[PDB]
Amino acid sequence: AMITEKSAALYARAVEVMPGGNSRTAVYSSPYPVYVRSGSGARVTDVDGVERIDFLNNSTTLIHGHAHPEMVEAIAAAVGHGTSFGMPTPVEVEYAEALSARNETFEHVRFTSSGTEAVMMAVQAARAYTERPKIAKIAGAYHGAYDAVAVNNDGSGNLISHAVTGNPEGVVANTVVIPFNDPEGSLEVLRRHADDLACVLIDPVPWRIGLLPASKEWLDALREFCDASGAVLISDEVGSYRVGYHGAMQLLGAEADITVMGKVIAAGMPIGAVAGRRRFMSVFDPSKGKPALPHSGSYNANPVSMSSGIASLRLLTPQAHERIGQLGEQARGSMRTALGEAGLDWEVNGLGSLFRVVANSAPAGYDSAAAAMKALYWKLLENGIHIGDSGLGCISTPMGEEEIAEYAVAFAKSLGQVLAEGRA
Amino acid sequence: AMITEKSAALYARAVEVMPGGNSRTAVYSSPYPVYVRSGSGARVTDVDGVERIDFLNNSTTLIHGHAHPEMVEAIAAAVGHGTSFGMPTPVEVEYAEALSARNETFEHVRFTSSGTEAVMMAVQAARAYTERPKIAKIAGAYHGAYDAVAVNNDGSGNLISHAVTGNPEGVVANTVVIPFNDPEGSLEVLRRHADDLACVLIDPVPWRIGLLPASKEWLDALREFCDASGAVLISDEVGSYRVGYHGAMQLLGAEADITVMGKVIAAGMPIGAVAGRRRFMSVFDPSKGKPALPHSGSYNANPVSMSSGIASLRLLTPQAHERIGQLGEQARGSMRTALGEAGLDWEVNGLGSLFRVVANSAPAGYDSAAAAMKALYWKLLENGIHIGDSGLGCISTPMGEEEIAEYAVAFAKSLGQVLAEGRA
């Protein structure tokens, strides 16, 4: 049924000028991904002219969906005045005020062009502040390509060092790994390295290890350990921020020293932010002589990304937050019902507007749970829906009851087709 | 004469929500920088309503100046179709084709959201390709905040390891430094580390050590060493690309294995690129199983940055390149004349549309050459001109001979005022 000839033709061009026709590993699919030309509200139109409802929204970036009229106005108007400057602008101050207001701990903020840069600068800030070499991170949690955090970032629960080919021992030996939601197991590792730990880097709701939230007991253990050891508690909320109106740590009853943010804080334009207590952020302060930590970047605080940010936070009202949370609860409930009726032991995790289908037992005709989930991703595409190829999805503010109802129909139909093709 | 009350008021707000009221170290000035609201062509209007000619252009990013109508049209149209997607787009393929066409060596390209990310991924690519730990870089050359390259990046010619506070020995010990344009001195260091060298990372025209080009003999020595040792030759042209129509290495008669690009390739929107021979870029290829080097990023190849790129390269014609080169030659000549007539021993370096005033002897009343150059930066601001506070500047395509003549008048006047205030 599904026609992808224009996607195939774009891929045939792409392989001549990009490695395997790819510029972003996460969006690749074999033998080629679906190419898209436009988005409007909750819907994306592919290069073959097929409109689908987007339930992943650029990996949870597009909290306001595609080309939101108020976002388009703010961004296009900013572009008309100048895309970037070698001088600060009013909108960087306005946006820093808007973001600082979202959480007590966001006292001082700095902007980057990506969550990847923001995580790197948060780690560098903790190292500059403490003058200690080691960082602790969660086993399996992903924090972007920065080499110190590109360690055990593949969804594995194992604590054994596993890094990208070529990442030197000099980097890998200074990143230690803790088990998510295991207070005793985490404190064993942290206490071993306490004298040398610059920071404990967590994601309070890491999707790669199942999109389960950090427990109160685990967050309390890490908070107490950081207070006692002087290690900086860094909450990487580039993905998980959106679960709470004041971010993920606040929802789960905890306080970070530094929070890393991105994605929804500008809802489509390149952004990252490091937001923390004044004392941790003081390493960046250049106003009292040379800063401990120089931090530049050609697009830092560029007025287009700042204008995108102001519009995104303005549209992200308590009412909008509550409504996408309701739709997320409805979507997760409907998926659990459909999986149960299909006779699968698969789970659905998530908070607020985030969800993940977690494939457990491989059904007949699939070599793995992951292969069955990829098949479900492709069947959902055929049935007019975009989700993640490992089960990640999210609600956007343009969605209503009708989009979630259509999703429920497509999900049940797609499960049926996946299972039937496995038994064929 | 100069009124900055609205800049002072923005700074008073900024210090409450940013460390020292700063989000980008390079744009800070004491006691506060001038804040700007808009740019049009070659001119920038500050928050106090003062229009000045911009001779630095967001640190040499804005080759087409501010809000170029053809750039604004292309970017606004892309924004209207969707700012970013979890799927590739036609414009990423079109832009990869356009950028690949600029140089024989740009066989495969990958896009990032910054030059900082692009340098990091080029280093990671060389480490993945060679499975060797060490990188060599130029003593004093700047390549962004990535910790492996944030070593000896401060304009010093000394080879002694000097890193940011907190950068661990594990990182710093794997970055070795070579003396710019010293073939024998460079080969001594490179031969010592040959078995363990993943890459030699150069900038062919590094501005921080004076904006002098790499010599044929030095480039030949490095090229021969990389061929013999298997180390990857990486040319970081994020700043220096614009000196040549095919980039900096090609202008100077040399070939890189991998080239890092940014700034002018999109001329205002967040971008970086890694471009190189297929074999070096193959570490990123995800089409024949798991890639050696995963490389994602929420804004990689986003259609707004791709559309900015297509428009920038379309406007960057051989004719535009030639004319801004003429204006650069005129500007450098006029500054040398003015410095000579003022009785200063200061030099003016640069190729094509780039220049740098290199302050040598401190005149009466200044503690350093750098302090005298900062005073000249402030006097030029008073006299209607933006340059860099350490002498960097560049031509934009909206400039004509009249803007360079106005600059020459302001430059001579500013030198006079700097010298008079020193003797006061």
Ligand SMILES: Cc1ncc(COP(=O)(O)O)c(/C=N\OC[C@H]2NC(=O)[C@@H](CON)NC2=O)c1O
């Ligand atoms: C916790 C966290 N920290 C940092 C980042 C990077 O932010 P970015 O540079 O703005 O994309 C991200 C961004 N994306 O991570 C997940 C995303 N990126 C990926 O590479 C894959 C998961 O790992 N291969 N799939 C995804 O959906 C993040 O989630």
Ligand SMILES: Cc1ncc(COP(=O)(O)O)c(/C=N\OC[C@H]2NC(=O)[C@@H](CON)NC2=O)c1O
């Ligand atoms: C050779 C080279 N490689 C990488 C980068 C970083 O690219 P970006 O993240 O897109 O800003 C750059 C970007 N800026 O470097 C210069 C610029 N950046 C700064 O941090 C300050 C201090 O450094 N020289 N002054 C500047 O003029 C670069 O020139």
